[PDB]
Amino acid sequence: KYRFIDVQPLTGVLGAEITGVDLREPLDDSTWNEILDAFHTYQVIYFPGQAITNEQHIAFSRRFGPVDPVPILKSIEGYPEVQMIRREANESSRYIGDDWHADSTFLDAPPAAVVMRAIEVPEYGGDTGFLSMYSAWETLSPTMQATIEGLNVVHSATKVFGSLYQATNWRFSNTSVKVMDVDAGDRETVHPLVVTHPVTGRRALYCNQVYCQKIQGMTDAESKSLLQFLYEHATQFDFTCRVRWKKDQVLVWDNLCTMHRAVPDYAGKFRYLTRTTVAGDKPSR
Amino acid sequence: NKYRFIDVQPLTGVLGAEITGVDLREPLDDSTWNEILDAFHTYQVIYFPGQAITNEQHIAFSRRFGPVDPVPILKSIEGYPEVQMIRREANESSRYIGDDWHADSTFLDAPPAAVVMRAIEVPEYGGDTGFLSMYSAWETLSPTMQATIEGLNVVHSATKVFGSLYQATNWRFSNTSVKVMDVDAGDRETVHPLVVTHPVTGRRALYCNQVYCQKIQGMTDAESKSLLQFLYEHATQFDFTCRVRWKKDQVLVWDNLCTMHRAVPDYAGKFRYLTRTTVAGDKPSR
Amino acid sequence: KYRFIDVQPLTGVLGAEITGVDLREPLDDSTWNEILDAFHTYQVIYFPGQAITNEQHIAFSRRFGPVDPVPILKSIEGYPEVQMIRREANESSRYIGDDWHADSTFLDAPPAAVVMRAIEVPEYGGDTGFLSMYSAWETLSPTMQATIEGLNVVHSATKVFGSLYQATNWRFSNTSVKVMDVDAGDRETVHPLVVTHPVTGRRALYCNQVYCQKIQGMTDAESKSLLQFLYEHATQFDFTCRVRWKKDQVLVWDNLCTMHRAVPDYAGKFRYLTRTTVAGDKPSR
Amino acid sequence: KYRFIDVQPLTGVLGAEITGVDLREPLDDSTWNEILDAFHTYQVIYFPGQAITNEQHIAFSRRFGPVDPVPILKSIEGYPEVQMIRREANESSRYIGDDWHADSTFLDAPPAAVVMRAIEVPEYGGDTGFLSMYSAWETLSPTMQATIEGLNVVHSATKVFGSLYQATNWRFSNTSVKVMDVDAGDRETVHPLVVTHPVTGRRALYCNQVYCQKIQGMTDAESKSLLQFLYEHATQFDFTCRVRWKKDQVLVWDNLCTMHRAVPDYAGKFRYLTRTTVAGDKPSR
Numbered sequence A, C, D: 001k002y003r004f005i006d007v008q009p010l011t012g013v014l015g016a017e018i019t020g021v022d023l024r025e026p027l028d029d030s031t032w033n034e035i036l037d038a039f040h041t042y043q044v045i046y047f048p049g050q051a052i053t054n055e056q057h058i059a060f061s062r063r064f065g066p067v068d069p070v071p072i073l074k075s076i077e078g079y080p081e082v083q084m085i086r087r088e089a090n091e092s093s094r095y096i097g098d099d100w101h102a103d104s105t106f107l108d109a110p111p112a113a114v115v116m117r118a119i120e121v122p123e124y125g126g127d128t129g130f131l132s133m134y135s136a137w138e139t140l141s142p143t144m145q146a147t148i149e150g151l152n153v154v155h156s157a158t159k160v161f162g163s164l165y166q167a168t169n170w171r172f173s174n175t176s177v178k179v180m181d182v183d184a185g186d187r188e189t190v191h192p193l194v195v196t197h198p199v200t201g202r203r204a205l206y207c208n209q210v211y212c213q214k215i216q217g218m219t220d221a222e223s224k225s226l227l228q229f230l231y232e233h234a235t236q237f238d239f240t241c242r243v244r245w246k247k248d249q250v251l252v253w254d255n256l257c258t259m260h261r262a263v264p265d266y267a268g269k270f271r272y273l274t275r276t277t278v279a280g281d282k283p284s285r
Numbered sequence B: 001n002k003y004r005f006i007d008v009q010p011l012t013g014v015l016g017a018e019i020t021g022v023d024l025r026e027p028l029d030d031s032t033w034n035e036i037l038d039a040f041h042t043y044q045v046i047y048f049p050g051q052a053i054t055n056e057q058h059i060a061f062s063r064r065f066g067p068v069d070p071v072p073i074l075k076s077i078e079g080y081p082e083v084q085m086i087r088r089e090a091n092e093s094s095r096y097i098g099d100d101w102h103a104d105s106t107f108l109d110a111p112p113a114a115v116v117m118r119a120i121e122v123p124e125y126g127g128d129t130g131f132l133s134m135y136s137a138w139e140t141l142s143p144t145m146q147a148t149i150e151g152l153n154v155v156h157s158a159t160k161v162f163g164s165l166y167q168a169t170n171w172r173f174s175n176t177s178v179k180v181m182d183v184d185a186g187d188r189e190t191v192h193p194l195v196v197t198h199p200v201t202g203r204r205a206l207y208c209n210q211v212y213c214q215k216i217q218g219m220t221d222a223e224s225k226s227l228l229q230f231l232y233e234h235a236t237q238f239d240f241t242c243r244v245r246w247k248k249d250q251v252l253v254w255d256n257l258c259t260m261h262r263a264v265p266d267y268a269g270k271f272r273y274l275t276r277t278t279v280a281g282d283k284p285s286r
């Protein structure tokens, strides 16, 4: 099918390695257009073997949308737009992204994508998981969809940098996390439980254990029952895929219909990636 | 309280009331029966102590709310097919009858609207019967949640009392009050809403039970399980319940649409005997 | 059976009415031995129609053990040993005894029994619930018992007057609750999961949602799964009974093997009972 | 580390690719000692690019142990020791291995390993999951371990070809499933919950929702809760890995310390593998 790029899917649910196009070089319109169609079709896409410069890097995210850095992550020197996912060899500190989630939904308008580029990865370990919230919502019964179709959910960063994160035990290392503000993190914002992708118009579920605190207008007692069920349902194995990282590998994931998570199976070893973050609109029903 | 011909004393702040000042051997005058009924629709369960009536007065009294309609699995006595047993020998390992919360025979397409029981031989202490109001079950939910589930229907079926899941269990029921009901009558499915309105009251309730409710219509076994388990957790709080204590010839009527009930099994070794008719009801609607 | 007192049990599981004894005038010893003997068999005991004085009251509790008032609750004018469980006819704030519990299990040595006296109670409503943790534990499979037999549980008063309590909604209105110390509130203390009664030597389960924070030495995830089960199992309806309050009814419950809770089925009304507390030694397996 | 074989691990938890040895030609002892030693460290091992015969296949497993075909699976013409994993492109009815499990544990001694060969697999789709029940066990608290250490569990083929399968909603397809004996299926068996692997002497948790009915000695309520916790815990994402199948790739997995499952994302596509099953001893604590 695809003509200007060679597209090799990873599973029957999400993901594809794309090859036969050099991201060091400016992309013509028919090449990049297919790149987009894949991303909107395969949700995560990665390009192995791309020795790009941080400038070519920022340039590529710019095609999807404006660079909108995430609050939390420290920038690389010189490029405020380029942020680290760096973890030193001396470990024992919370891993970033230890659980399934989408990135920073506590914003009123959270990112639409983010592109990661592997600098130094360990020979084995420190994979990254990805799962499809198209598949999450689509495997529900209509009766269930029609029941939960209308509900909205209250997100908040209190857990990752708010009140509850201040009254707990350990922290993140300061190698990729900025000192945050206790109240700006603890800030609420409301998103639907079921979002419509702006481009695909296909419907996905929208919730995660990192930021979703409760359903708007529900007693905690219900909200927990119901969100605990979705987390159970949406994080089945049959929905995921698993990216393995090799130097100069570059990846783009859709931050609205895919959740991701980092696997902490590399203690003792060094692991460094970089990532720009592309902006999005208020998530819409 | 505000009552003419009857002395009516509640049991809790939620449901239940004692009725006194009337002989149920004595066909009630009309000014009396109207005041009795107003309670039975506000206190949901009501009981009369001591009334040493008969199976001819007994059947007469159920007949006033509605027709005598025996329930399938139970047995009626020598001479009276209309009066059905709640009998347990002082030695029965056999399963207890009604030992989880339920409304009676909701797998019927139009399940009963009330039922009247009479203490024949009850122990002094032991064998109480519990009740909770599913109005208050539903009322204590957030509007948002009511808003979410008001439209769902639930598929009831007796496949647990006399269908496949009961035909392949362990201990069976006590064959004292259980008749040979069969496999196909049990496994038979039937659908009533999740949320019901009382015909007489215009109040909204809730309608589900761990004995007969199988799944939410149109939901995956895994969805239906989470949501129904949540609702039971919630409708069987202690705050919604009350507990009746039985003294021989205590005669009692419960509403089998806005209340659940269950038989507390604290008496094995004892003999415990009640009789019960079963006034018939309508199909229950949203 | 009982010769000096009239004993009419309430259920087959636990609970009993005692009659045929005048609690205003000192009890002869054979009468008090049968009183206690019932208290130890039936766990909860009530004496209806006992028009007693605050002095006969304290003297009656001192036959169970030295009177040590509980923190939190207010003492009556003139008697420090008598405590209020008073509620005005304005139902602004949260109820006392709202969920199943035993009294102050966060103490290192919590109360052994406590005696309540109905001052003025509503016509219908304002019940108190009771359940037997002998019955909880004896209904576990022998196999199950040996699994948990050895476990310990970390109790704490936070949620009632610690850091987690001063954080969320309502307070208790101070018509019977005193201002507490958060450092004693967050204070932790460790008891068995299965306690052997001092006097009867029968074993009871020992855990409650008000005070139990976690199983000693378990992961938050493990401990949560496990306490959830026991609370589900131990608060079945079949194990409970329901005492209905009438003026001058005097009640004694074993605060070691019975859990209790108070019903808010009396909103709008006025309900006032008073209560002394008999002390016990640290619970032992 | 490794000298006669090239061992490239797959995650930091379990899994390894083996290269630098031709499995068509007999193993010398120095080479085989390393192969086995790899199998025992990494639990799942696979070799890419091995165009072997049903005979070299069978020859290779006997090096692990005697081959005793698994009940259920249809064998290929000419080699009853070789069993099919075939699914035609006309595929709806239940997939084989749809959930996490160890293979046929209702036996009194379930296989210790099994070796699989990709005959013709789809370009993408139908990957196979693997998770380490060492890690299941290893991540429990010491306290928790001592609690569940002692228990035994009743496994049964009721669910796959026993009593309840003969009266459910849907069925299997006979391209690789045989007509099974109904009571032979309903036949029970008891294994420890925590097994000590013969060779490695490491301990693993041993339970799976496909075959485990209940814990010996517990009430349906107890047994139901406890395994639901253990299934939740042992099937975290962080414990798994994912093998992607490519033609003539040969895989060996340890059937006592790993569970596996088949991913049903190849609908419409054609997938065929072959597998011998190596025998084991009664599983021991």
Ligand SMILES: O=C(O)COc1ccc(Cl)cc1Cl
Residues within 6 Å of the ligand: A070, A072, A095, A096, A097, A098, A099, A101, A102, A103, A104, A160, A210
């Ligand atoms: O950077 C982001 O958008 C948020 O990432 C996270 C997700 C889960 C957890 Cl537990 C912690 C972190 Cl920092």
Ligand SMILES: O=C(O)COc1ccc(Cl)cc1Cl
Residues within 6 Å of the ligand: C070, C071, C072, C073, C095, C096, C097, C098, C099, C101, C102, C103, C104, C105, C160, C210
């Ligand atoms: O005596 C104690 O410290 C324990 O008493 C209580 C426990 C729980 C609640 Cl909700 C209210 C009260 Cl008074």
Ligand SMILES: O=C(O)CCC(=O)C(=O)O
Residues within 6 Å of the ligand: A085, A096, A097, A103, A127, A128, A260, A261, A262, A263, A275
């Ligand atoms: O370390 C990784 O795999 C990515 C960290 C992550 O998930 C994130 O960027 O939010």
Ligand SMILES: O=C(O)CCC(=O)C(=O)O
Residues within 6 Å of the ligand: B086, B097, B098, B099, B104, B128, B129, B262, B263, B264, B276
């Ligand atoms: O209380 C009882 O024992 C009987 C109640 C019951 O289960 C029924 O009549 O169906």
Ligand SMILES: O=C(O)CCC(=O)C(=O)O
Residues within 6 Å of the ligand: C085, C096, C097, C103, C127, C128, C260, C261, C262, C263
């Ligand atoms: O208010 C009641 O009836 C009892 C409440 C309670 O649990 C207590 O005072 O310890």
Ligand SMILES: O=C(O)CCC(=O)C(=O)O
Residues within 6 Å of the ligand: D085, D096, D097, D098, D103, D127, D128, D129, D260, D261, D262, D263, D273
């Ligand atoms: O196709 C697969 O992944 C294997 C099927 C399976 O589960 C088994 O071998 O038992």
Ligand SMILES: [Co+2]
Residues within 6 Å of the ligand: B098, B102, B103, B104, B261, B262
């Ligand atoms: Co009933």
Ligand SMILES: [Co+2]
Residues within 6 Å of the ligand: D097, D101, D102, D103, D260
């Ligand atoms: Co298998």
